[PDB]
Each structure stands twice: as C-alpha cells, then as structure tokens.
Amino acid sequence: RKFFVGGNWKMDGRKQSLGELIGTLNAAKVPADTEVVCAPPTAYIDFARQKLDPKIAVAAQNCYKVTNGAFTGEISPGMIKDCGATWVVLGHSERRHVFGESDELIGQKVAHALAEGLGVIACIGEKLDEREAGITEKVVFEQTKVIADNVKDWSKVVLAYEPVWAIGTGKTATPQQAQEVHEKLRGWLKSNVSDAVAQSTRIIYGGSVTGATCKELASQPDVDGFLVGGASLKPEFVDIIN
Amino acid sequence: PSRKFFVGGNWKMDGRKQSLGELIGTLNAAKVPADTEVVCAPPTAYIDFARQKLDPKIAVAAQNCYKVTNGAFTGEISPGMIKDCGATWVVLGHSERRHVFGESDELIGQKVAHALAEGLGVIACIGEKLDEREAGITEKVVFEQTKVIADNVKDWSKVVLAYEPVWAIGTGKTATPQQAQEVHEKLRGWLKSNVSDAVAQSTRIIYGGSVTGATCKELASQPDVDGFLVGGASLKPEFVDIINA
C-alpha cells in the first residue's frame, strides 16, 4: 500500500502564509512510495492548486450532498473538481462533533463525492468516554459501515481513524494503540467487503501527530499514513511526509 | 448629494470557471457606467477567481461570513479571508440565510459588527415573510431587523440596505413597483427617526425583489429605490441592462 499523508490546513487562511507553506512543500522531497494531499480552506482551493506542484494533490475540507437549491450552502463536488481538487475530506472530527453532521449525512456525502468522481478521505473516531467505556470497536465499526454502504469502489477511498480524545482532551496515543484500532479496521473490511479491499485500503491516523511521534506510528504494519492537523501548518509537516 | 445607484449581483450558483468567467467577460466588455456602483457576489470557492478576471471598477462581495472565530476553521469564511481574497463587501442577512439556514437576528448583528471592524463594506438584507405581511406586521418586522443591524453600525458610509420582499419570492405573490417604494420609503424614515437625517438621505436602500430587464427601469424610477440586489437575473445577459437601469 502507498503511504498516504494528508494535510488538514484548518486556519484563518491568507495568501501569504499559505504561499509560504506551498513554497516549502514544493521544494520538499516526496518519497516515491508516498502520496501527498493538502486540504486548504475553501476560499483557497483554487489558489493552492495553482501554486502547488502537481506532485501534490488538493482536497476540499468538506462538501455538500446532492444539492437542493440552497447554493449559499456548502461547496459542491462539481466546484471542488472545477477548482482542481481531486479529494474531499468527509466526517472529520470537527464536522461530526462541533457542527453536528450526522452519520447518515456523511454517508450521503461520500456517495455523492464518489459519484462526482472525487477521491474521499473518510473519517471515523471514538470519543474518550466511549474509549474508556469499551465501546470503541462498536463505535468505529458502525461509523465505518455507513461509509462502506456508500462505497462501490474503494480505490479512491482512504479511511482515517481520528480518535477524538486525541484532539481537545488530555490524552495521548502510541504506535501500539494506533495498530490495535487500525488492525481492527482492516478486519472489518476483510469480512464485510473483501480481503482484496482490506489489503489495498489505506488506513491513516488522525490523532495529534507531531514530528516527534510520527516515525513509530508509520512503522506499524496497518498504519498507512496520517491525516495531520496543526502540524500540517508547520515545517515538521515535511518530516511527517518522510 | 444624490445617492449613487448601486447594483449587486447575487451569484448563487453551482459555480464554474467557464460560466463565471464568461459572465465576468461580459461585464468587463460592457460599458458599466461611472455612475453605477457594481458589486458581484460569487460562491466562496470563487471569491478570488472573479476578482482576478472582473474589471477593477467592479467590486467583489462574499455571500456570507462569520463573526469572531474560535477554532472550527472549517466553518464560514472569515472577513480577513474575504479581504485577503480581494473582496471589499459581504452580503449579510440574506433571506436564504435567515429563512432556510436559520440565522438569527442576533447572529446577523454580530456578523455586521465584525465585518465592519475588519474593514469590509456590508450589504445588509431585511424583509418580511408572507405570513408577516398578511398579519399586518411588515413595518414591525423590517424595522426590528433594521434596528439590529443599526445597533451594530457606527459608520453608515460602508453600509447598504437591501429590502427583500420574501413574501413575494417563490410564493405566488407579486410585488408592484408601488409596493416596493412604500417599503423603501418607510425604511428611510426609520433611518431618519432612529439614526440621523444625514444617514437617511445618504444610505442606499436597494431592492432585492424580482427584477428583470423589462422591469428594472420602472423600479429604478422609484424615489426611494437606490438600486438592486439581483438574484437569478444576475446570471444572465440582462444583468447588464439592470446595471444600466
């Protein structure tokens, strides 16, 4: 499986700050066995695609489902494609847990984005209370199932496990924990979909990853990459890529 | 002095470079009169593209924004971002935001204050729904909406008010030019009563009801109508005719 690194550029964006990042990425080495995706704020997808080296892909942070009037609402897959992005991030923790996007809405979005010919980074994760309460497997699995129900071809899908307790709470993950949760994901895919799908499908980690903690996580047999939050905005993002 | 005629195009669409670029091309090629202030509000995804094709004379607006932010960057575009992308206006309180996405009067006020703080112009939308109008409360509803905006405005220099007769949009009710003038006249009066004579005389109040190439000139002739917030016609060639009303 090709190693997969995504950068979730959640920020109060500017052409100057974004430009600097891009210049840095453009000058950076992308290892040959690696696929890199950057997701700017929506206003900057076009700008980013224009400045970024084609070696690096662009993702939208979100999209809407089949549109129903209401254009002031979210960017459509058509727009995302039009602006030259080839991926979308869906079910990201912030959308799930701050903005209240439903499991069903996410599944609908995945289906729509895929139909419109985008790649999908589909995000799942348990909350802390859930972690402690021994319902992590049940929670991620149900989340995955709804995403899975909306995927015909997995070739353009990447799963991102984001244990929420790894944003905004006081607890930390380890290469061990990542493997456990990650290993289980593949098993669900193997029984539920296919062994071929389970083998080829990248499962990336989205807990808070830093240049400090990236290498051990990468070494795990079932961690195929990262969905990076704050670190994506830093020079250490390059270290993460490598 | 006379209020400068103001025309905004509310480009609510599933946007494309090709269609948008063509529309901008048409505007660039048109003889936009010096005496008309023209503003185009594309989808967010196209907040930097238009400003890269449209004529400098033409001004770009965001369709919405957020108030003070905290985390949650995936949320609405900020005023800083809008400015950064070269837009100098934002449309706030648009009926679609109020009546479909449920934006509160309070939220709109916070947005107005923040947008102005950050150096943007504001197109502030007000208007009454059909039940409100039937119940005889048109003035009450629009005055209250206007009060909320007003409470968040210090300098009116960079504000334009747009009256949207929500009651006559998608309902089967038709607003007559006479009806539009009545609402516009009342709103100016509120400004006079509640802010200043100078503000009342100087503030553009633009019409956000259905306007077309065939109807623009009669509407523009109304004494208290300072221009338009153009919806669907703004995506069409007759948008130039409207500009020239």
Curated annotation (Swiss-Prot), chain B:
The modification N6-succinyllysine is found at residues 147, 154, 192. Homodimer. The modification 3'-nitrotyrosine is found at residues 66, 207. The keyword Magnesium does not apply. Triosephosphate isomerase is an extremely efficient metabolic enzyme that catalyzes the interconversion between dihydroxyacetone phosphate (DHAP) and D-glyceraldehyde-3-phosphate (G3P) in glycolysis and gluconeogenesis. The keyword Transferase does not apply. It is found in: Cytoplasm. The modification Phosphothreonine is found at residues 171, 212. It comes from Homo sapiens (Human). Its EC number is 5.3.1.1, 4.2.3.3. Pathway: Carbohydrate degradation; glycolysis; D-glyceraldehyde 3-phosphate from glycerone phosphate: step 1/1; Carbohydrate biosynthesis; gluconeogenesis. The active site is at 94 (electrophile), 164 (proton acceptor). This is Triosephosphate isomerase. NCBIfam families: tim (TIGR00419).
